[model samples]
Target: LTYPFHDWSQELSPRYAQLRASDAPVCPVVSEGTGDPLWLVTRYATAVKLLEDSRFSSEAAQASGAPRQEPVELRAPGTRGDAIAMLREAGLRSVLADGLGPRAVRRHQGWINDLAETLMSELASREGTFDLAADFVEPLSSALVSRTLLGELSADERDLLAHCADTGLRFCGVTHEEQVHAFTQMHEFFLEHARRLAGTPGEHLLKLIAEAPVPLSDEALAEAGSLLVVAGFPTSSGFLCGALLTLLRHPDAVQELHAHPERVPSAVEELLRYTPLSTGSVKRMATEDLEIDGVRIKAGEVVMVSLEAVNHDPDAFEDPDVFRPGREGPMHFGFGRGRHFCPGNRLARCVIEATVRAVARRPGLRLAVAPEEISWHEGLGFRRPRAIPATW
Candidate 1:
C-alpha cells in the first residue's frame, strides 16, 4: 500500500485491517510525500512498543535528511522551533502543565459549557439548514482557544491568527508557497506576541511560559507560542467537527448519550478511537538498530505508527470494527502515548464533552445533506469538514 493512506469521507481505509490481519504487521514502504523509505507499524502491541521505546526520538524528526510524511519544507515552520523539546530541556514542562493541564483547565469548564450552550442555541435557531461546522463548532472552539491560551487581543488579531493556525498545517492541495506564507505570518506574529508577554502576570499560557522560573530563549518562546496556537485551536476544532459528524450518523448513539449524560465521556473516548483526524502519523526516528515484528529497522531510519490501525486491531479490541462506547480495553492512542502524548488532553475533553452534551439536547439534529455530500479540508495534518450542513 502507498504511504499516507487516507479516505476523504472519514472512512478508515480497508488496507489497515488487511495489514493487521497479515502475518507480519510491520512492513517497509516509501512515503508518497517525502519519497523517504520507512517502516509502518500496524499491530497494537508493536505500535505501543515503538511509541514508548526510548530509542525512538521524536526530536530527530526535524534533523536534516530526516524521513518525513510531507515535503519536509512545508512542515518546517511548525516543527523547527521545537517548543515541547525546548520546554523539556529547560525544565518547564510543568509550567505548561500547570498552565493548561487538566487541573488548571478545570476552572474554564463552566464557561466552556456556557459557550457550547450559547453556540448550540444560535445554531438551532437558524432557518432551515445551516453549516454546523461554520455556525457552531468553529466559532465555539476558536473562542475557547483564543481566550484560554492567548488571552485578550483585538478581534482582528485573533481572527488573523486563527486563520493562520488553520492554514499552517496543510500538506494536501495547497501550494508550497501558500503553506509557507501561512506559517511565516503565524511565526512572526507569535514571536512578537511571546516577547511582549514575557515576564507578564496572568493565568494565560503565554504569561505562564514567560513567567516560568526557568530561562527559555526568545526563539524557544516564539516556537512555544506558535505551537500553542496550532495545538490549542485547529486540532481540537477539527476533532470536534469530526466527532459531531460521527454522532449525527448515529442517532441511536445520540439518543443514548442524551438519556445518560454521564456516559458522554466514555462515548467521547470511543469517538476518539473511531475518528481519523490526521492523514498520516508523525515521524519518529530510531536512535539505535531495532527489530519490529522480526523486521530490522536500522539506526536513524524513520518509523510512522498508524494510530488508527492500532486503535482497530482485533487483538487489542473486541469487535474492533464496531462502535461501542463503554467497552474498555487497552487505552486508545487518541491523545497519543509516551512522552509526546498531548498535554492538552484534559482541556480537549472538556471542550468535546461540553459540545456533545449540548448537542445531545437537540434530539432532532441530523445531517441536512447526505453523508456523502460532506466534503473535508484536504491536508496532511488535520482532515476535517469544510462544512457540515445540518437540520434540527
Candidate 2:
C-alpha cells in the first residue's frame, strides 16, 4: 500500500482508477493531524472483504485513540460502553425494525407522497427561483425523519434536533474541541427530551429506549436517542439533495420516472450507487493480523473502507461514472455491505422514492441554475450539498 497523500473525496476517483488499472489494492497512508499513519483500503473486492471480515472491528477503532469531541455541550457523564451496548441491543434493533420494517414503511408511503406534494406546492408558489437545499431538501428530510423517529417531541424539542443538525454540520471540519462542543449540545438536547419522556411513552424510537426490556438510565437513553436523530437527518438530507440534482441534470431519467412512478424504487437504488451520499465507512481497526485480497493487515492498525469507491468500482458496474436510472444487477453498497450496514435504509429509500416521484409529477420542476454552479460540502464523513439553488 503506497500512501497517495491527498483528500479522498477530492482525489478518490483517480486513486481508485489507478489501483484498479494496476489490478492491485492500494493502501494509502493517512494521518489525522500529526497522528500515526493509517492505511486506506482502495479496492472494491478488498473493501468488501474487509467490511465483512470479523477480524476488523469497529469498536476497537472507535476507542483506539483519545475520544474526539465537538463544541456542543455534553449531556452527562456515563459509561460509553453501556451506551454502545444499548444501541446494539436486540430490543432497540427490534424497535427499529418495527418502526421502519417493510409493513411500517408501506404505511408511510402515502404520508411521504403527501409531504412531497406539499413541498412542491410551496416551491411552485415561488414561480421564479429558490435555494433547494434550504427550502426543500433539508426541511423535507428533517420533517419526515423527525416524524418517524421522534414524533412525540414537543415544538421546543424538535427545534433542538434542528439546531443540533445544523451545529453538527458547522463543526464537521474543525478541531476536536469544536466537534466535542457540537456533540455536547446534541447530548444536552437529548437528555432533556429523554427526561421528559420517561413517564410518558410514545411510538417513536425515544419511547422504545425509555420503555426498553431493560431500561437504559437517563444518560444512556439520551445518548442513544441523539445518535438516532443525527443518523436519520443529515445523511438523508444530503441524499435527497443529490438525488434531486441528478434527476434534474438527466431529464430523461425524470421523464421516465414521471411516466412510471412505480419505477422510482429501483431508480433510487441506482442513484445510491452512482452518487453515494456517505463519503466513506467509519474507520475500523484490525483486531488481529489478517490477509484480504492478497494484502496483509497488521493488528491495531486503522483502516478505512471507501463506500463511494466500492459503489463506483468499474469491476462492479459497467460505465460506473455514468448515471443509469433503474439499472438492475448486483446490489450496491450505498447502505454498506455487511453486518454494520445502515439500519435506516428502508426509511431513507421510501423518502427518496416518494420525493422523486412527486417532483417528477410537477409540471414546472426544473433547475433554476446550471448544475455546474452547485457547491458541495467536503472533508466530512458524509457527502452532501452545501447549497443547491434551483427554480420550480
Candidate 3:
C-alpha cells in the first residue's frame, strides 16, 4: 500500500526492493491525489526498454486527459508554435549542437580542469570542515554554466537563476501549484535576461540564442533559458556531491581513479549508475495501449521509471551496490536511456571527472562533517543533498 506523501521514502525503499527481486516490472498500486492511478516501472531492463519505446511518448503526458501541470509559458512574443515545438524550431537543436558538440565538449576539458583547480584552492583553506555542497559543488556548477552556457547573464541574472533553482527545489513534493509558481518565476527571470541581452554582444548560450539566424520568440527564448538554468546546475551539483561521498566511503576506488585519471570518462559511467542524483525519469504518459515486458499500460496513464533502481539492480551489474571506479559494460541508466538520453551527459561527465581529479590531488582533503549530519533535500524530482559539509 502507498503511504502518504510524507512517508514517500519509507514507502519507496521496500517497493524498490520488491521490484529488484522480481524480474517483472511492478506498477504503483496507489493513486496520486489528482491523477488516476499511475504506474511506477521498476525493473532495470523493463525501464530501459520502455524509455526507448516510441509508442510511449512524452507528448502523451501533455494530452488534456493526462495528469500533469500546465505547460510553463516559455516562448517569447512572435513565437510561431507550441513551447516544445518552438524549442526545435528556434534553432535550439542547432545551437546546442554547435555549443555542446564534440569539439566544444573536448575544449571544455581545459575549462573543467582550470575551474576545479581554482575551487580546490579555495576549499583548501577550510580543510575538512566546510559545506561541500555550498562551497565546492554549487560554486563549481554555477561557474561552469556561467562560463559555458550563460555567458550573457549579468551577476544579477546569475543570482536569479540560482534562486529559481533553490525555489524549485523547495516547491518539490507539494501541489502542482508550487511547481507552477517556481517555473513561472524562472520564466520571468529568463525573459528579463534575454531582453537585456538582446542587443549585447556576449559569448554564452543566451547570447548565442539571441544572435542565432533563426531568432527565438521571447517565449521560446525564455523556455530555452529556463531549460539551461535547470539543466546546468543542481543535477551536476548533486552528481559532484554524491561522487565525493561515494569516494570517501571507498578509498580504494579513489586511489584507482587517481592512478588512472584517463579512465575518468569510464569511471563517470560507473559513478552515474552507483549514485544517480535523480530517482527516475520525470513523469511520462503512454499515448497508446502498450505492453512492456509483458505488462500492459493504457493510454493517458502516467508512468515513472526509477533510474536509481535500474542502475543498482544486481542482475544488471556485478556487486551492483559497490562503488567501482572503472567498471565497464552497460551498467547504468544514470542519464536515462534511448532517444531521451540526457543531452548534457557529456558536459556532466566532464565536470565530474575534472572535479574528482582536482580533489585527488589535494592530499589533505577529507570529509568535514559526518554523513548523517549532512542534510539531504527531498521532493526534488531529482535527488540531491541540500548541504554536504566537508573539510580538507
Candidate 4:
C-alpha cells in the first residue's frame, strides 16, 4: 500500500472519487514514509468520529512513527499536548478577530482585486504568456498573506520563505536538517520582526497579537507570526494554483462564474469541494485501544487519516468525484475541521474568491501548456503543480 498515496495523475486534485469505493470501512496497511504498518481510515463517519474525539492522540502520533505533516506553526513547539491545540486555537481566534474582520476583509478583498487584476494585466501585456505560478499566483498569494498577517516582507524575506515552502512541504523525503533550516528561517525572521513591529501603530494580526490583553511575549508572538508565515504562504499559493488548474479544466465552471461574478462566494465553496488540498504529512495515534467502525485500532498505532479520501467519500458528497461548480455537499474539509480547523480561511477565501471574479473570468484564460507538461513537487504531503503556463 502506498500509505501516502500519490494517486492523482494529470487532474488538478487527487483521485479519491474512484479509490474510496472500497468494500471495507477501514483497511490497515504499511506506513510508506516510515516502514511501520498502520490503518487507512476511509469512511466519512469514522474519520469525523476519530478527528473530533480527543482519544486519538496528536502527541502519541510520534510514537506511532507518523511524521510531522501538521505545519510547524500550527503544531506547538515539540510533541503533542492540550497546550499545542489550545495555543493554536487561541492564537487563531485572536488572528481571526484582529486580522480577518469584515472591515479588514473588505480592505484585503479590495487589494486582492487590485493585485489579481494587476497580475492578469501583467499576464495580458506579455507578448506570449506568463507562468501563472511564478508571475501571478505565487507573488499574489505571498504578498497578500505577508501583508495581512505580519505586515510586508522584504524581497529577501519573501524569497527565503519561498525557499522554506520548497523544503518544508517536501514529500520526496526531505532531511530533518533541511526541514529544520526552513522552520528556523521562519522562526528567526519572526523573532526579529516581532521586536521591530512592537509598539508600531498598526491593525495587522501580528501587531494585534503583540498588543492584546495579557500580552504574548515577544518570543510567543514571534512563534505565532512564524506559524502564519510558514503555513499560510505555501498553502495560499498551492490553493490558487490548484483552483485555477481545476477551473481551466472545467469550462462549465469557468462560464458559470465568469458570467455571474456575484456567484463567486458560493462557487469558491464548490470549487474547494471539487479540489481539496492536503498533506500526507499529518496523522493521529490511538491513545488507547478502541473500536471504530467495527475495527479495533490498538493504542500507539498510527492511522493515516485521509482528508482527501474523506472529502471524496460518496456518503459525504453527492457525485463526489464530479467537478460540478454548485454541487452541494456537507461542509467541505478544505479548510479542515475540529479544534484545529484551519485558521485564516476567511482571509484566504477573500483573496481566492476575489481572484475567481478577476483571473478566472478572463475570456481566453486556459492552459498555456499541455497538462502533462506541468510539473508537480514529488514525494510531498501537499501536491501542487509547480508551474501553470497560461494565456489570458
TM-scores, each model vs. reference: 0.93, 0.87, 0.87, 0.86
TM-score quality measure for candidate 3: 0.87
Q: 1-392 in candidate 2: lDDT tens per residue? A: 32322232323446656555675574645443334566666567777888898778867765625222222222223336334445666356766677767866776777777888888788788757887778888667766755666555565766667556545544245665655566677777766766665445435556655666755777777777676666777778777887887777788888888888778778889888887665444466788887777777788777776677777788778888888876765788888768778778888888888777877787457777776666666555455667777776
Error of 1 at 380 (Å): 4.3
Superposed on all Cα atoms, model 3 deviates from the true structure by an RMSD in Å of 3.6
Worst 10 residues of 4 by lDDT: 72-81
Off by over 4 Å in 3: 1-12, 31-35, 68-85, 126-128, 152-156, 169-176, 198-202
> lDDT score of model 2?
0.67
lDDT of each: 0.78, 0.67, 0.66, 0.68
- Give the per-residue Cα lDDT of candidate 1 at 374: 91
Compared with the true structure, the alpha-carbon lDDT of candidate 3 equals: 0.66
Runs off by more than 4 Å, candidate 1: 74-80, 197-202, 215-217
Q: Which stretches of candidate 4 lie over 4 Å from their true place?
A: 7-19, 57-96, 101-103, 197-202, 279-282
Worst 10 residues of 1 by lDDT: 70-79
- The numbered model that scores best in lDDT is 1
